[PDB]
């Protein structure tokens, strides 16, 4: 399996309700392992998976120190951007930062990411070369010139290709029982088909990990129904993921159609058909 | 442009007295601010870290405290200094966030805490005249300055020729020696040489001054001894050029 | 220990390459520093490095190896003015952790050694006098006395930039009449060769 580590930062200004709300979460693949919320009592980075609890007091002091320096950067940024965009002090505004690294099944570097948004839109993004910037508009071009002059891309390259991949590798080892698990989806079939000529068949997938899955509906051959009705993959809340896909068929031709479930943890691709 | 000033530069205070060190940065905003101490060796213990105005992170259980009442204003204090609070206290700032992580240091605050002010003595200063032999052997003239019997051991020695400070021809001992190596409270001595051409020493229009800045008690320190109070002061000795 | 560098003092001849080394234990560290500190003064950045390999800036080369966990500093063409304490530092846990410093002494190259002991008289009385051992080369060391009320200073490097002349000096003095310049130095003097004038 390929793997990723990602950190997600949100700050929201709230004039006359004091300092920006700041929330940080870390992920390994689809498992959250840390967070910081400026409104909680701890004022600390806190564990959110059992395998990060192995880390000693220096980890938690360090990540607390660093997450607050990130928070302080966003506070300044919210002020700066109100200036760049000529905005009042009245409104709530959002800054977002995402960064991290992907590795392949050999756990070697594939790709690095460092991206910033303002009010839900792209502001500045590190390109795949880990030295070029995409600036969304005139304001982001000011930021671009400042971050070029200071060699921000060179600093990020050192973390993205080095630090990020080896701490990802450390987490994948220490959390081996969670993170390298592959829970195959428990599947089944529902027939909710209360039309005269037409039946609708939903093909279910519960308790799987990771969240990556494919729910093809097939017919006689072809393989395709561009008319499938699949809900966004959702958290079960226990650390596993749920999904289904739906196709509308004739009430006669019940058992001419096949659900093709694909998951990393299934030896062979499953293949389900309406059983009375 | 960017600037970090700390004050005072040197303090000699009794055990039990209050401390106030100030630090000021100009030419940046929202900096990271740090208090480090250098004691019992080189290398730096972090005492306080501040990510922003009002925010102080204490990095070791300690008798000191810090505050940051404005963006560019960092303060270190104690109500009651201990003997063990002696050290070189360094203020530093870094750019908002987590950049390269380069630290810009202030010029530092040297704090000496004494059990007893009774042992504080300023230096006696004497200038020794070049040897006629040296001038005959080398056509060079070496003046020697002796600062003796001072305590504690922070003095700044400079050389002034015709009321201009010189640096060329000067070498001052890096550390003072103990006048009695055996005694914990020994007074100290320091030697400097100024070397000039034999023809510069011979020209009697030429005025040589050795100046020793001493850091001692303040105006408001209590003083119980007969002798005048050994405050911060400059002790000098002089000599003119001798063609003879 | 988080940041380990040898104390020294490390002695290097004028014009040779000084080698400073530093190891760190925390694999979370993401940039690396050498600061220089003159006696009495505050530390001043020599350079930083955050990429594996060498970084050159004039006479100074930093080297970083994140696999071995070591940072070096090389100083080409060392000068007496490079004599200082060199502080290794590591950016980890959102702050700079410092080593305890490596003290470097660059011994000056004395072109034209001319070892002599001179008596200098006080410009207030002849009575009080000091002894100046001078112009010896950097191989001579000076020993503290086997006598209370005799004071001997370490050697010190004096530079007349404009003449192009460096000289080494030590000073000795006593609170006593018993004391001659004749034999002030209970240390490895330059044999006959040291000039002792007849006052």
């Amino acid at each position: 399996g390929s793997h990723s580590m990602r950190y997600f930062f949100t700050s929201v200004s709230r004039p006359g309700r004091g300092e920006p709300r700041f929330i940080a979460v870390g992920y390994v693949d689809d498992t959250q392992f840390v967070r910081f919320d400026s409104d909680a009592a701890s004022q600390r980075m806190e564990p959110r998976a059992p395998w990060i609890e192995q880390e000693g007091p220096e980890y938690w002091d360090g990540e607390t120190r660093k997450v607050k320096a990130h928070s302080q950067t966003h506070r300044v940024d919210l002020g700066t951007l109100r200036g760049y965009y000529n905005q009042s002090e009245a409104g709530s505004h959002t800054v977002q930062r995402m960064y991290g690294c992907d590795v392949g099944s050999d756990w070697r570097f594939l790709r690095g990411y460092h991206q910033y948004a303002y009010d839900g839109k792209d502001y500045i993004a590190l390109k795949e070369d880990l030295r070029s910037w995409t600036a969304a508009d005139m304001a982001a071009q000011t930021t671009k010139h400042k971050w070029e002059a200071a060699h921000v891309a060179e600093q990020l390259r050192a973390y993205l290709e080095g630090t990020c991949v080896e701490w990802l590798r450390r987490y994948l080892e220490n959390g081996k029982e969670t993170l390298q698990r592959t829970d195959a989806p428990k599947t089944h079939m529902t027939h909710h088909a209360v039309s005269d000529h037409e039946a609708t068949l939903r093909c279910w997938a519960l308790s799987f990990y990771p969240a990556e899955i494919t729910l093809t509906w097939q017919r006689d051959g072809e393989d395709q129904t561009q008319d499938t009705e699949l809900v966004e993959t959702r958290p079960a809340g226990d650390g596993t993921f749920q999904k289904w896909a739906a196709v509308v068929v004739p009430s006669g031709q019940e058992q001419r159609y096949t659900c093709h479930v694909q998951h990393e943890g299934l030896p062979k691709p499953l293949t389900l058909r309406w059983e009375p | 442009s960017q600037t970090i000033h700390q004050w005072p530069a040197t303090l000699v205070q009794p055990v039990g007295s209050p401390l106030s060190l100030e630090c000021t940065v100009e030419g940046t905003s929202n900096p990271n601010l740090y208090w480090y101490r250098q004691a019992a060796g080189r290398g730096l213990q972090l005492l306080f870290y501040s990510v922003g105005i009002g925010q102080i992170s204490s990095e070791v259980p300690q008798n000191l405290s810090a505050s940051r009442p404005q963006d560019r204003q960092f303060i270190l204090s104690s109500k009651k200094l201990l003997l063990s609070d002696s050290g070189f206290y360094l203020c530093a700032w870094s750019e908002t966030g987590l950049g390269t992580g380069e630290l810009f240091f202030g010029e530092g605050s040297r704090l000496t805490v004494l059990e007893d002010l009774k042992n504080v003595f300023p230096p006696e200063v004497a200038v020794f005249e070049p040897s006629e032999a040296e001038i005959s052997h080398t056509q060079k003239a070496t003046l020697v300055c002796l600062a003796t019997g001072f305590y504690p051991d922070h003095v700044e020695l400079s050389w002034w020729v015709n009321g201009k400070e010189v640096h060329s021809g000067v070498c001052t001992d890096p550390q003072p020696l103990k006048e009695q190596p055996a005694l914990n409270d020994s007074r100290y001595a320091l030697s400097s040489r100024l070397r000039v051409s034999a023809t510069f020493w011979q020209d009697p229009r030429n005025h040589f001054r050795c100046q020793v800045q001493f850091y001692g008690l303040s105006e408001n320190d209590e003083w119980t001894q007969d002798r005048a109070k050994p405050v911060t002061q400059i002790v000098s000795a002089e000599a003119w050029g001798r063609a003879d | 220990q988080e940041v380990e560098q040898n104390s020294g003092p490390l002695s290097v001849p004028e014009g040779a390459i000084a080698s400073l080394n530093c190891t760190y234990s925390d694999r979370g560290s993401q940039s690396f520093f050498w600061y220089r500190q003159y006696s009495g003064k505050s530390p001043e950045l020599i350079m930083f490095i955050y990429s594996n390999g060498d970084k050159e800036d004039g006479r100074f080369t930093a080297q970083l190896n994140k696999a071995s966990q070591y940072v070096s500093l090389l100083i080409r063409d060392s000068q007496p003015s490079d004599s200082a304490t060199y502080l290794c530092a590591v950016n980890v846990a959102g702050k700079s952790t410092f080593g305890d410093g490596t003290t470097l002494t660059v011994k000056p190259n004395i072109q034209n050694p001319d070892p002599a002991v001179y008596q200098l008289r006080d410009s207030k009385s002849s009575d009080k006098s000091v002894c100046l051992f001078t112009d010896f080369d950097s191989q001579t060391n000076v020993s503290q006395s086997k006598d209370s009320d005799v004071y001997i200073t370490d050697k010190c490097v004096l530079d007349m930039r404009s003449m192009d002349f460096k000289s080494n000096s030590a000073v000795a003095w006593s609170n006593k009449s018993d004391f001659a310049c004749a034999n002030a130095f209970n240390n490895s003097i330059i044999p006959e060769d040291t000039f002792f004038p007849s006052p």
């Binding site: 300044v76 700066t80 973390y159 | 987590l98 | 979370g28």
Partner: peptide, 10 residues
């Protein structure tokens, strides 16, 4: 592990 470099103000 979080970034400890490359975080500057916009």
């Amino acid at each position: 592990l979080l970034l400890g470099i490359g975080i500057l103000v916009l």
